[PDB]
Design a protein around this ligand. Structure first.
Ligand SMILES: COc1cc2ncnc(Nc3ccc(F)c(Cl)c3)c2cc1OCCCN1CCOCC1
Length: 300
């Protein structure tokens, strides 16, 4: 195994000025602010994950594990960790993804989202996940909700609190069968989740096996049932989703194939997704002359 010489950066607290919450509840409190790497004269829009203040030795492990992963990836379609802050509870700082999670985005923008964007998105996650495969990380929690929007043309995967190395040693509806029955997890289990995610976006944000309670899923799937073809979907596309849902995992597409196949489709997107009124579809404060995007903020 290669050594991991990622650098973990430790950020002071005087180094950044929070400016509004975004996501309390569930587990923590994703805020949003601005990071001014002192002695640089740049401000970086950032989000900051200071999970539920309660500093129970439990969750400090879960978050440093996240950070460990995030510090160690580096690729345009995956969210990298900028640094962490060690204040009382551990804050996780990262490039702000201003337009939120891809799920909310589709749900909130149905009547304006084109095939070109839908397909492009799939291209981008397939890339993000292939990068993770190159680095041998099994994501284990791919979902619309864990993909973020930097701009409508630029999504990036996220949430690695469950990420792991292939070989090493709970969201039912996104999980490959062999994961539900025998907690086996591969890049090919990720591909299934990809299929489910793709199905999420084609349905503008539906909920997979809406209704069906989790305990039944394992049976439903063994029976041979899958998610239905969404309306806008050509058979060519539904066929990819379904190929992601084959029992014999080796028979599922590889992410590099998915990058390829959707990429083909994205050149002529109207032939692959039939959307009403496709052709006609189009998708900050005080001092900011110094703002630079994390993606443009690099270090040696
Ligand atoms: C503007 O919306 C976001 C931008 C974001 N930009 C970057 N990162 C986010 N989340 C995130 C995800 C994983 C991480 F490890 C870290 Cl450090 C941050 C972001 C989360 C964001 O929103 C999360 C979904 C908001 N809901 C709103 C209702 O309450 C629950 C959460």
């Amino acid at each position: 195994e290669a050594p991991n010489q990622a650098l973990l950066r430790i950020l002071k607290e005087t180094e950044f000025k929070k400016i509004k919450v975004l996501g309390s509840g569930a587990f923590g409190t994703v805020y949003k602010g601005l990071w001014i790497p002192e002695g640089e004269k740049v401000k970086i829009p950032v989000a900051i994950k200071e999970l539920r203040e309660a500093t129970s030795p439990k969750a400090n492990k879960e978050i440093l594990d996240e950070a460990y992963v995030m510090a160690s990836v580096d690729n345009p379609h995956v969210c990298r960790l900028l640094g962490i802050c060690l204040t009382s509870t551990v804050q996780l700082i990262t490039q702000l993804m201003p337009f939120g999670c891809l799920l909310d985005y589709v749900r909130e923008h149905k009547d304006n989202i084109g095939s070109q964007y839908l397909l492009n998105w799939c291209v981008q996650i397939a890339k993000g996940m292939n990068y993770l495969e190159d680095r041998r990380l099994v994501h284990r929690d791919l979902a619309a909700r864990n993909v973020l929007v930097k701009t409508p043309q630029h999504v990036k995967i996220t949430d690695f609190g469950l990420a792991k190395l292939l070989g090493a040693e709970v969201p039912i509806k996104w999980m490959a069968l062999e994961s539900i029955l025998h907690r086996i997890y591969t890049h090919q289990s990720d591909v299934w989740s990809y299929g489910v995610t793709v199905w999420e976006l084609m349905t503008f944000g539906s909920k997979p096996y809406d209704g069906i309670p989790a305990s039944e899923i394992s049976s439903i799937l063994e029976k041979g049932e899958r998610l239905p073809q969404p309306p806008i979907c050509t058979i060519d596309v539904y066929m990819i989703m379904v190929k992601c849902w084959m029992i014999d995992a080796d028979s599922r597409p590889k992410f590099r194939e998915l990058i390829i196949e959707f990429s083909k489709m994205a050149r002529d997107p109207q032939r692959y997704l039939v959307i009403q009124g496709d052709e006609r579809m189009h998708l900050d404060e005080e001092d900011m002359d110094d703002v630079v995007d994390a993606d443009e903020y690099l270090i040696p």
